[PDB]
Amino acid sequence: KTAGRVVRITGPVVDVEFPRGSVPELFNALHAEITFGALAKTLTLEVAQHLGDSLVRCISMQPTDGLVRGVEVTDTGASISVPVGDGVKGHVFNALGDCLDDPGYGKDFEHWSIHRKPPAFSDLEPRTEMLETGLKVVDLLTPYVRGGKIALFGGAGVGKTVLIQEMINRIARNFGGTSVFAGVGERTREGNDLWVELADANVLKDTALVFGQMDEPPGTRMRVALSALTMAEFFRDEQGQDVLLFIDNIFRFTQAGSEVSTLLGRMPSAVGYQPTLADEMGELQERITSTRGRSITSMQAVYVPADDYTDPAPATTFAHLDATTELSRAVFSKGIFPAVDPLASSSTILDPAIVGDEHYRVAQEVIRILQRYKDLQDIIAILGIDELSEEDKQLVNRARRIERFLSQNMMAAEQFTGQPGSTVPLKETIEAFDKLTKGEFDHLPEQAFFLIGGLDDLAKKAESLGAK
Amino acid sequence: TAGRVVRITGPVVDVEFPRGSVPELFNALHAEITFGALAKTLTLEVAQHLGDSLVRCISMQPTDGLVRGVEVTDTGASISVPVGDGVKGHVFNALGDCLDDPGYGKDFEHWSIHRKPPAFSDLEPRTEMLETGLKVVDLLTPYVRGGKIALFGGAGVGKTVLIQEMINRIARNFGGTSVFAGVGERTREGNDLWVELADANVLKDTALVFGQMDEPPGTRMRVALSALTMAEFFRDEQGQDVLLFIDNIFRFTQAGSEVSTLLGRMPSAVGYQPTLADEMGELQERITSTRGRSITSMQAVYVPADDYTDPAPATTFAHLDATTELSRAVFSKGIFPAVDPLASSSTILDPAIVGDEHYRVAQEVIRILQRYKDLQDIIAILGIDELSEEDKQLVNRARRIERFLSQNMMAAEQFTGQPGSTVPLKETIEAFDKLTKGEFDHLPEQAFFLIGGLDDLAKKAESLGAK
Amino acid sequence: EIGTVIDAGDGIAHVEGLPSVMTQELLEFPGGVLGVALNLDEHSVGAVILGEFEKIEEGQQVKRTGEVLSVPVGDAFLGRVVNPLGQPIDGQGDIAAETRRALELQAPSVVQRQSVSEPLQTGIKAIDAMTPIGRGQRQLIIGDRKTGKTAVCVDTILNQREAWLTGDPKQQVRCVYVAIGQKGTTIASVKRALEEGGAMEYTTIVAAPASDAAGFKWLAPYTGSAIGQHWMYNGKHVLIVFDDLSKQADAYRAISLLLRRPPGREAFPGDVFYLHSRLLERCAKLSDELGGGSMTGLPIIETKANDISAFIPTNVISITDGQCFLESDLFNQGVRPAINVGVSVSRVGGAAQIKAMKEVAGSLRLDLSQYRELEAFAAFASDLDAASKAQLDRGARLVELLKQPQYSPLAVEEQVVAIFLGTQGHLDSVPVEDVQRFESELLEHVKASHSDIFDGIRETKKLSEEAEEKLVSVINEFKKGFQASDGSSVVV
Amino acid sequence: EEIGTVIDAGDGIAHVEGLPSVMTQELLEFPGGVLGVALNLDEHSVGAVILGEFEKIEEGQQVKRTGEVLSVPVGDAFLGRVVNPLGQPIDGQGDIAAETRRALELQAP
Amino acid sequence: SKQADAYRAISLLLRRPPGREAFPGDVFYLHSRLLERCAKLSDELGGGSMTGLPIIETKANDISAFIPTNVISITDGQCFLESDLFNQGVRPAINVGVSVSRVGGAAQIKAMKEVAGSLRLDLSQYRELEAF
Amino acid sequence: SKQADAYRAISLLLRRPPGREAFPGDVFYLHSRLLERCAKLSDELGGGSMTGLPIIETKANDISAFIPTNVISITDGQCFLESDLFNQGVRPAINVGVSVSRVGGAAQIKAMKEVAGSLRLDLSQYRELEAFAAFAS
Amino acid sequence: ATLRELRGRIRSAGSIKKITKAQELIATSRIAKRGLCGAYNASRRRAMKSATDNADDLIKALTLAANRERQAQITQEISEIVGGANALA
Numbered sequence A: 001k002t003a004g005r006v007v008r009i010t011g012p013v014v015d016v017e018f019p020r021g022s023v024p025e026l027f028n029a030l031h032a033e034i035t036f037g038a039l040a041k042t043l044t045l046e047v048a049q050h051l052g053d054s055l056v057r058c059i060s061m062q063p064t065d066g067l068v069r070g071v072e073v074t075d076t077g078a079s080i081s082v083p084v085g086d087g088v089k090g091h092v093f094n095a096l097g098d099c100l101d102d103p104g105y106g107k108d109f110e111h112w113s114i115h116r117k118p119p120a121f122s123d124l125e126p127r128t129e130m131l132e133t134g135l136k137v138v139d140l141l142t143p144y145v146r147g148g149k150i151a152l153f154g155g156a157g158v159g160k161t162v163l164i165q166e167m168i169n170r171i172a173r174n175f176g177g178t179s180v181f182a183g184v185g186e187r188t189r190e191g192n193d194l195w196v197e198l199a200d201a202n203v204l205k206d207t208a209l210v211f212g213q214m215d216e217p218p219g220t221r222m223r224v225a226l227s228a229l230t231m232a233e234f235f236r237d238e239q240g241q242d243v244l245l246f247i248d249n250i251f252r253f254t255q256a257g258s259e260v261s262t263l264l265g266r267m268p269s270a271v272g273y274q275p276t277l278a279d280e281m282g283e284l285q286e287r288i289t290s291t292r293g294r295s296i297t298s299m300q301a302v303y304v305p306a307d308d309y310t311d312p313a314p315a316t317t318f319a320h321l322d323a324t325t326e327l328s329r330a331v332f333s334k335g336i337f338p339a340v341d342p343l344a345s346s347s348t349i350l351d352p353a354i355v356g357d358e359h360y361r362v363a364q365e366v367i368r369i370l371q372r373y374k375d376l377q378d379i380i381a382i383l384g385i386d387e388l389s390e391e392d393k394q395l396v397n398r399a400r401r402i403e404r405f406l407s408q409n410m411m412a413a414e415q416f417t418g419q420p421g422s423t424v425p426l427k428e429t430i431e432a433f434d435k436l437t438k439g440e441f442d443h444l445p446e447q448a449f450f451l452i453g454g455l456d457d458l459a460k461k462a463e464s465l466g467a468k
Numbered sequence B: 001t002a003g004r005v006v007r008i009t010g011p012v013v014d015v016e017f018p019r020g021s022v023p024e025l026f027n028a029l030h031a032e033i034t035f036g037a038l039a040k041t042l043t044l045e046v047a048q049h050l051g052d053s054l055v056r057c058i059s060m061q062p063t064d065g066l067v068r069g070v071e072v073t074d075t076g077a078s079i080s081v082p083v084g085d086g087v088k089g090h091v092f093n094a095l096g097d098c099l100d101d102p103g104y105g106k107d108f109e110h111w112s113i114h115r116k117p118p119a120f121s122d123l124e125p126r127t128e129m130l131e132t133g134l135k136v137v138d139l140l141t142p143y144v145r146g147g148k149i150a151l152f153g154g155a156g157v158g159k160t161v162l163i164q165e166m167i168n169r170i171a172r173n174f175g176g177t178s179v180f181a182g183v184g185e186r187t188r189e190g191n192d193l194w195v196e197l198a199d200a201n202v203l204k205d206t207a208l209v210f211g212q213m214d215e216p217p218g219t220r221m222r223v224a225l226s227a228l229t230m231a232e233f234f235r236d237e238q239g240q241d242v243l244l245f246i247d248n249i250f251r252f253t254q255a256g257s258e259v260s261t262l263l264g265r266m267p268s269a270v271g272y273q274p275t276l277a278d279e280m281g282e283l284q285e286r287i288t289s290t291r292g293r294s295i296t297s298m299q300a301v302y303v304p305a306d307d308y309t310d311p312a313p314a315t316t317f318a319h320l321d322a323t324t325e326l327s328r329a330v331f332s333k334g335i336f337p338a339v340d341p342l343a344s345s346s347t348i349l350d351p352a353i354v355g356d357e358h359y360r361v362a363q364e365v366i367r368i369l370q371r372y373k374d375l376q377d378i379i380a381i382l383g384i385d386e387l388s389e390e391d392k393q394l395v396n397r398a399r400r401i402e403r404f405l406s407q408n409m410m411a412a413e414q415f416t417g418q419p420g421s422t423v424p425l426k427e428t429i430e431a432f433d434k435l436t437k438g439e440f441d442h443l444p445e446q447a448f449f450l451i452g453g454l455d456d457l458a459k460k461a462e463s464l465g466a467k
Numbered sequence C: 001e002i003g004t005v006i007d008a009g010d011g012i013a014h015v016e017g018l019p020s021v022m023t024q025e026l027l028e029f030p031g032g033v034l035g036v037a038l039n040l041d042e043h044s045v046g047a048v049i050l051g052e053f054e055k056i057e058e059g060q061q062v063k064r065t066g067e068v069l070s071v072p073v074g075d076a077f078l079g080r081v082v083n084p085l086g087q088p089i090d091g092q093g094d095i096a097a098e099t100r101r102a103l104e105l106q107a108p109s110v111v112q113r114q115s116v117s118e119p120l121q122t123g124i125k126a127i128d129a130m131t132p133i134g135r136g137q138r139q140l141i142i143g144d145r146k147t148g149k150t151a152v153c154v155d156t157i158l159n160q161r162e163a164w165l166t167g168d169p170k171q172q173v174r175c176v177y178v179a180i181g182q183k184g185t186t187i188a189s190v191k192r193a194l195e196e197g198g199a200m201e202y203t204t205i206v207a208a209p210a211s212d213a214a215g216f217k218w219l220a221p222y223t224g225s226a227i228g229q230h231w232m233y234n235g236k237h238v239l240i241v242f243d244d245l246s247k248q249a250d251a252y253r254a255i256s257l258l259l260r261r262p263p264g265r266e267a268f269p270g271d272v273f274y275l276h277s278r279l280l281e282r283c284a285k286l287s288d289e290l291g292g293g294s295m296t297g298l299p300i301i302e303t304k305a306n307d308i309s310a311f312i313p314t315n316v317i318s319i320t321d322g323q324c325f326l327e328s329d330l331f332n333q334g335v336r337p338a339i340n341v342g343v344s345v346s347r348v349g350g351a352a353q354i355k356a357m358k359e360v361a362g363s364l365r366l367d368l369s370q371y372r373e374l375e376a377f378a379a380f381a382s383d384l385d386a387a388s389k390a391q392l393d394r395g396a397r398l399v400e401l402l403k404q405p406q407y408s409p410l411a412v413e414e415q416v417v418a419i420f421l422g423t424q425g426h427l428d429s430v431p432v433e434d435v436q437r438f439e440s441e442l443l444e445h446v447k448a449s450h451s452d453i454f455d456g457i458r459e460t461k462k463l464s465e466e467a468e469e470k471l472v473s474v475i476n477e478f479k480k481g482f483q484a485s486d487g488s489s490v491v492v
Numbered sequence D: 001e002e003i004g005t006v007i008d009a010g011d012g013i014a015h016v017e018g019l020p021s022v023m024t025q026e027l028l029e030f031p032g033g034v035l036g037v038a039l040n041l042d043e044h045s046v047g048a049v050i051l052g053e054f055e056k057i058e059e060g061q062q063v064k065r066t067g068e069v070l071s072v073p074v075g076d077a078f079l080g081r082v083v084n085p086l087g088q089p090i091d092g093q094g095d096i097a098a099e100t101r102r103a104l105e106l107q108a109p
Numbered sequence E: 001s002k003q004a005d006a007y008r009a010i011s012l013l014l015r016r017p018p019g020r021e022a023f024p025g026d027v028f029y030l031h032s033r034l035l036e037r038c039a040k041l042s043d044e045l046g047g048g049s050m051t052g053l054p055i056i057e058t059k060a061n062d063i064s065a066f067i068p069t070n071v072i073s074i075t076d077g078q079c080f081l082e083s084d085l086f087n088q089g090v091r092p093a094i095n096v097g098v099s100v101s102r103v104g105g106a107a108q109i110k111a112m113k114e115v116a117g118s119l120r121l122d123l124s125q126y127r128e129l130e131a132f
Numbered sequence F: 001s002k003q004a005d006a007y008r009a010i011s012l013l014l015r016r017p018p019g020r021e022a023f024p025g026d027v028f029y030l031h032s033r034l035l036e037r038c039a040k041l042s043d044e045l046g047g048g049s050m051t052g053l054p055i056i057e058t059k060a061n062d063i064s065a066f067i068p069t070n071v072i073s074i075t076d077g078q079c080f081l082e083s084d085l086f087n088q089g090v091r092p093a094i095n096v097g098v099s100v101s102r103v104g105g106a107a108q109i110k111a112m113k114e115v116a117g118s119l120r121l122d123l124s125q126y127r128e129l130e131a132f133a134a135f136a137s
Numbered sequence G: 001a002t003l004r005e006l007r008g009r010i011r012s013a014g015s016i017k018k019i020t021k022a023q024e025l026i027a028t029s030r031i032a033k034r035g036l037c038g039a040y041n042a043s044r045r046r047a048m049k050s051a052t053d054n055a056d057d058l059i060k061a062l063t064l065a066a067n068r069e070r071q072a073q074i075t076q077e078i079s080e081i082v083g084g085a086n087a088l089a
């Protein structure tokens, strides 16, 4: 007739044979039924390849356990579509658009396909407006861009999720637009905690949550980001809102793509990744851009495997970001929070033409001092600071104080220490770091600079340690 | 009795022939590209007999525009190149076509580029020193007349500049023929060499064979064989001394590895063809001097990623009589030529040939440099003052020695603006013997940088104020 | 002849039929889609889809154009942004193409060229004085991310503004900027930087953003090369930037793996070196008989963790006429541009400089390399000799001199005067921390009071003896009034 | 009943022809009380990962369906017991009164 | 770790191309789908819970390897026992600086919190102080 | 090493499964089979013998590579030659610290065994004391 | 390249270790009877013992990193070889 049947089942990937002339288009959503009592469900398959001889290779959005060869597969005629509109705000959805906190919600909404072309080149406008988060390190050394793309890199357990929560607390709370949070291959309990916290903070009503978590087939883990991006794109294009898009974690999208590619029979590229890694990343990222007159301020957490920043996934992700904040294990070991690597992190608007001459000068002086400290660290590890010249000893003391002062007590860190977070205005940050570089605070103890706010807190803690 | 194209994947073409008409291995086949913008005649070298009357061949020219099932004509012989004195003073590609004068040499005698190496009986070792005039080469890496010389080094360490310097210092006064083989190098370099040889009136004695890095792998693999065939004709028939310059030999291996997988071969270590050493051995054993017939071969060897343990240079090392390894560290210190004195070697750098004094001075210099290398890290961390007085004296001596091994080369005038200099062997030995005895410890080390002999040393010292 | 798509997926297709199809031929798939035939065997034809492959389906009819890959070319492409097919993407309308040019055309032969002898001023003191670039040269801008590679290339493009304004074809340089795998907003910002500096009047942008299929990212450098070659063969001078070629390598590797060609190092295809080498050998300095035109290439390579031993960086280094290494460690130190002096070189050498720059900067690169070596050696010296102290002071002053901010190009004469200051010992009296300011101020003085020196250098390309003496006198007179931050007099 | 046949076996893997109605991740019985899990299903055969003594698997052996999707017995009877990953007691204390069977690949909350 | 080794063996015997350290691409999926089922169910589902205590064997205290980082990215904190403290005689050899409990602060009686909240970072810093 | 490389080329051209460094699974077998024919026959078989002196060329003094590891395992003793000693003037550049002969004194005449007994201790102690050559006092 | 750099750093640290141990012993002898003193200006035997211990720790860390890189290089080389072989299968 017009319905195909399953011929091969190799994990999440399923081959479906269709009658001649009825082969579905690429990315079309097909439906199959698993009837076994425990695993009974309706698999949604996505057509991935045309194999020839009327065969198609498709990625299953649900576990294919219990699926039988030869069962009927029906073509929906369209790709996976998700609900869009103001209704999505304040509700939790999965990758397929099903509402989790209220099943059946949104079935009557407008539905948009999760596959779309990025905005035309003529519609793109570079963004250079700074975004004042309130963190010393971010504001000084890698200022964020409003309407731009921000990324947080780092290995396992360095503070990616805590920093995402911090930025949600510092940006989303005082936000007149819409927020979309895409949990991609993350802890499910983390998603529940975010749901509860946004409900408590009253930010949930303005936020749309889309969760495809660790315990999902790779197809779902690689399509949930597209679903959330579709919601955000609807909010940007149709309603003319300022959209915040938080993704955690994009590397999980890349890794799910790698798993699918292995299951699709594609030959692997370096480090076993899919050959199409850069192209898939480019599609997904370029869809996340902000167009002329319509702003999406995205913020993505990028997991770095084995703390290897040379890994292909973050290596390709680097080029899609206006602001980059790389979290270092070495910094984390010192207890510095956020565990940012000031030398590795970068921002495209940290130039004197945008942030002013004073901010740029102070940032460059801080970076130079930290670079010199890093260069000296190799002699230091062997011989203390005792063998350095007088200038080098002074610079090392200044650099240690600066790197302690780059740490801050964050709002999201209260649940770990009980200490309420602090906010430092950009002007105060520039003034304090100018003073540090000039050597005005060199007489205070190192611990006076650890996990504090501005200059007032610095003075209070110096007093607490018996110092000026 | 002609074949037809069946498969085309880049530079590898499968051709099907009628039964009994299968071409012999290495035969040259002709195919036609008729596309207006890319009309040409592909030359295909039979590489494999696939069975069922199919043969896999490497295309010497780009295969863009080729169509499946087109006529393929078997020439019945391997790729041939013109031979004779007429080749001298002209530029040819891997197929023997003249570039400076198209159609020239089509009437000369033609020799197949595939040949066997000389019989082991005819081979006879060579031990005569070849004096160049470079302090480092003359002292630590003496060259052999009629022997095999190599200039190893990564990218941009001075292999090509040193090849030009040796052309200036050896080929200009040479009483025999010279053959230059530009194997997979920059076309600009080929044009520069052509113009330079024309200016110095040395082109008339030189035959140039160029296969550039923008040509398909087949040309890069067979250009060296073409040039070696011309050199072999000069050695065996004319019976006159031959100078053979190859730059870069590693390009032959790289092109061989490019088509290896496309030919069905499984990759060896470091993604090299399994027949790396076999092809290298054939090509390098064809480059040699026989009893009474002398070929002085100088080859520039690229070391991938400055890694001397790479299978290509490692395999190449065994085929050389004298090796000059250029080092990235020496290059980055500003020392030119960027020779690594500790890693260099010469089969004739023993007392029996070079004499007792030369050997003693060279060994003392090598020992001092090795000790300085050992103390490099201690100096870097703890400082020089913590060394013993003898160690400090040795460190100063070694710094001055390493600066003195540098020289201003004639071919480097366009890079430093300073005219080159030549140092006779005896002066080099005397100066380095004086250096190893501490006779110049008072002079600043900067006085020893990029100079010639002892007269230049005195001039530079008095310019800096020392004496 | 009409073939049938026997399978499709991931931007690749296999099509049966078309027995008379050429290798690299341009095939038309329904809906206006375009493919390139790469693999030809008796079974079928493998094709790379150049865009919107989601519309390809099994059984679709495929037509053969009969033309190998080619792009429109003409002067109408100046100031326009186009995709690797030459189709405008800036939304400004159709481009009037003078003619067409195949992408795979052989580079100029070894006898069709002439030695590189014309400077291509980048306006950057470090490059112009230490690793000069001539017209017809391939200079590799290689380095880690966020090291200023795009800054160097965009500054080089902008510095051609005066040459373009001269109106003399022998002096004008036409620019092509190929962006491969770059985020679209980054290309937009680059276009903005060129427009604010009035560089789009003579610049074309070939854009293959990361959203484009791997085919466009693989073709874009060849499209830009063909567009530049059309001008080059008509007596014009062209500067072409590839940003980056590593993205080309990644896209080509993806295409090859999808076509199931056996890979090699880092899963790259065996012929990736051939790809880059045949792309970069078309940047040449043509002989006078061919019009004397030239194309100067500025390929950009990004190294991960400063690992220049990787496959693609090694290949590209071995291909080009010199390299310009940029280091993040040098960048953070304040050395901007962060050019590593010891490892950066230009194989053209002094032939790419004017006579004055050649005389002032004869041994600058070697001097700075030796200075870095000595500085490393004397890191913990307790009592340095006199010669070593003098060398260290001179090297520190030179390093300060070579520093330069962004979007601040210097005319060749001003660079000549600055290097004259540095290498003639006139900065020995000035404290290191003030050198920069001193330099700048002196230039302005010579600009406002003794401009005849600049005109003499710019018209004769040589610093005459009388001009040199006048410059020394002016330098001393300015030193008299110069105010050092530390308060020390800079006289004598 | 449905019965397939081993078409090849090696190093912990087996291939079974037949069993048209086998599920994905189904449990298959090979002679001698050996078990396998069907991972790869294709038009030709089924690739099964063996769980236990693989050395008893021979070509031509008769393979039977179990009807269960990689499940194990579950119940309070497992307290104080030592079992293998299949839920079979290995402490030698007799059978385990399993309340029911639970599939191993059920989604998380 | 031994489960990961066994799964790698099975995958290689299936001729599935491997990735880092010869492990397949879905080893992370293996461990993550295993450990996502240790949850604290809501009161609607009965309020029951399963507590996971996965064990991982590192080589030479290398917690930056592939599988250790995967599991760290999966679990809610780790208790890193380092061989140095164990051999010195400090047992249990908890590494104060690295060990952490992401969701452990709430799950702690009042007295234990009040007494040990300081102790944690106090020892974390006293390691560094004793370094001198 | 060159024999192993040639055998690897032969095996790869025969499509045999490659292992570490692309060598086949019986390269160690190749070398062990070659080198176990060097024996010391019993008096019943004439008492003849064949002594093997295989050579191995390491790269960057990497004795942990595949073929060097195999051959070191096979042989009864090793003479490690280092280019650093060679450049120091120590020639033959045998590293006495790491070179070993498992046959030992059984392969020496009585006079050689007596005279050479103290040599090992003296050389080891000299290597220990090397660092103090600057402070003889 | 990283493996070669690690090996070079290991030999550097080893030389530092031997020189520091020799200095420590000589300082002990002198006690029984320049700036390498630990913090006298801000004793030399204490500083040299600390330097030798730090060099030991650095050598151990560098050796661990070098062994990790050796294993990674072997695994990646085998990965490329087997990928090519499978492609040609």
Ligand SMILES: Nc1ncnc2c1ncn2[C@@H]1O[C@H](COP(=O)(O)OP(=O)(O)OP(=O)(O)O)[C@@H](O)[C@H]1O
Pocket (backbone or CB within 6 Å): A154, A155, A156, A157, A158, A159, A160, A161, A162, A163, A303, A337, A338, A410, A412, A413, A416, A417, E072, E073, E074, E100, E101, E102, E103
């Ligand atoms: N600012 C902070 N103050 C105190 N502790 C912190 C801070 N940031 C992070 N931590 C500690 O680090 C742990 C890990 O942080 P987080 O979950 O944000 O990291 P991550 O990079 O997202 O980790 P993973 O890869 O496991 O998902 C937190 O549970 C908390 O224990």
Ligand SMILES: Nc1ncnc2c1ncn2[C@@H]1O[C@H](COP(=O)(O)OP(=O)(O)OP(=O)(O)O)[C@@H](O)[C@H]1O
Pocket (backbone or CB within 6 Å): A347, A348, A349, A350, A351, C144, C145, C146, C147, C148, C149, C150, C151, C152, C302, C336, C337, C404, C405, C406
């Ligand atoms: N000479 C310079 N002085 C000061 N800042 C500079 C200089 N050159 C570049 N920068 C700044 O350095 C940052 C990196 O510049 P650029 O985009 O050219 O680098 P890149 O290496 O091409 O980066 P990417 O990897 O993002 O492509 C930008 O902020 C640029 O403004």
Ligand SMILES: Nc1ncnc2c1ncn2[C@@H]1O[C@H](COP(=O)(O)OP(=O)(O)O)[C@@H](O)[C@H]1O
Pocket (backbone or CB within 6 Å): B153, B154, B155, B156, B157, B158, B159, B160, B161, B162, B336, B337, B407, B408, B409, B412, B415, B416, C322, C345, C346, C347, C348, C349
């Ligand atoms: N004697 C020398 N003096 C100064 N510079 C030199 C000398 N020899 C080589 N160089 C530098 O080394 C670089 C590489 O030169 P070349 O030999 O052409 O490349 P390769 O070493 O890769 O063959 C050149 O850019 C040149 O500036």
Ligand SMILES: [Mg+2]
Pocket (backbone or CB within 6 Å): A160, A161, A162
């Ligand atoms: Mg997290």
Ligand SMILES: [Mg+2]
Pocket (backbone or CB within 6 Å): B159, B160, B161
């Ligand atoms: Mg060269």
Ligand SMILES: [Mg+2]
Pocket (backbone or CB within 6 Å): C149, C150, C151, C243
């Ligand atoms: Mg850039």
